[PDB]
Ligand binder design. Structure first.
Ligand SMILES: O=C(O)c1ccnc2cc([C@@H](OCCN3CCCCC3)c3ccccc3Cl)[nH]c12
Ligand SMILES: [Mn+2]
Length: 297
């Protein structure tokens, strides 16, 4: 009955020498990490960027997420500040589990998330501050843009190769900016790959962990076949870009069908890299703040 956690994806803890450049580092770990689809990177302990969003004016209208909307086939929106969203998020989680938010084990949130996704008896609705452009209120990383103050001790982070604003994003051919995610408990993203099969890199600036699931690219077609077998018939014929709006699937279902799935809890201050055509999905353990961008090698 209970969710069975997938095996853990690789975690790398590069020394300062190895931490010199994301592209060089990712190229070096690729023989392992491309076989798990996702990996986690823990920066050296002394690498701690300051949070550089304009928190005063940070306002947003999160999207509403009904966990069991797909099983349902078988109000709208409030404006928040970062602060008021956090107060709502913590209240929701502590009320839901009847304990302080930081005392809820990550395995319990995970088990309850997947129970709720398939539950026809309990309708749980959460909110996700998803796809907030970093051009709106700024990146979470400091940038030498002249649109905000950079202290001297923050300049190294504005120039760091691991600053997501400094990733190479142009694709080579003869023929843009990071996105922000303000999470609460159970807010989620369903299974998808990136446009152009790009890499993506994801940084959790602060807050409670983000739980990830990843599938290596050599199993992409197997996952797509399981999806096509088990997706609602009304959605079976949809183009992939539209189907990926609603590709919610319990990782154990994929695993029972022979699809390799790995998991990780991304904690604050840690990066998650997804490799080309590595399907991934996840959910937030609680109030947090993430930044993500696609890049090409
Ligand atoms: O939330 C996270 O931390 C997270 C981590 C890794 N990848 C993703 C992908 C999403 C979202 O993409 C929405 C679609 N936009 C994508 C970027 C801008 C263009 C259109 C998404 C996809 C499915 C269902 C819900 C959500 Cl929010 N969130 C992710
Ligand atoms: Mn993604």
């Amino acid at each position: 009955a209970e969710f069975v956690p997938p095996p853990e994806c690789p975690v790398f803890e590069p020394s300062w020498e190895e931490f010199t450049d994301p592209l060089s580092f990712i190229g070096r770990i690729r023989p392992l990490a491309e076989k798990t689809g996702i990996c986690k990177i823990r920066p050296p302990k002394d690498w701690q960027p300051p949070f550089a969003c304009e928190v005063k004016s940070f306002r947003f209208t999160p999207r509403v997420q009904r966990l069991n909307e797909l099983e349902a086939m078988t109000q709208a929106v409030r404006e928040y500040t970062l602060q008021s969203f956090g107060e709502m998020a913590d209240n929701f989680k502590s009320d839901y589990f009847n304990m302080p938010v930081h005392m809820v084990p990550t395995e319990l949130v995970e088990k309850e998330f997947w129970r709720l996704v398939s539950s026809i008896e309990e309708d749980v609705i959460v909110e996700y501050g998803a796809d907030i452009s970093s051009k709106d209120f700024g990146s979470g990383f400091p940038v030498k843009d002249g649109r905000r103050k950079i202290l001297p001790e923050e300049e190294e982070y504005a120039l760091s190769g691991w600053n997501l604003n400094n990733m190479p994003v142009l694709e080579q051919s003869v023929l843009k900016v990071p996105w922000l995610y303000v999470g609460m408990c159970f807010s989620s993203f369903c299974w998808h790959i990136e446009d152009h099969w790009s890499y993506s890199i994801n940084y959790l600036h602060w807050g409670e962990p983000k739980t990830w699931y990843g599938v290596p690219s050599h199993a992409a077609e197997q996952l797509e076949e399981v999806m096509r077998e088990l997706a609602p018939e009304l959605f079976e014929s949809q183009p992939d870009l539209l189907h990926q709006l609603v590709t919610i699937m319990n990782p154990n279902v994929l695993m029972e069908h022979g699809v390799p799935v790995y998991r990780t809890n991304q904690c604050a201050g840690e990066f998650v890299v997804t490799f080309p055509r590595a399907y991934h999905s996840g959910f937030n353990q609680g109030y947090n703040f993430a930044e993500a961008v696609n890049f090409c090698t």
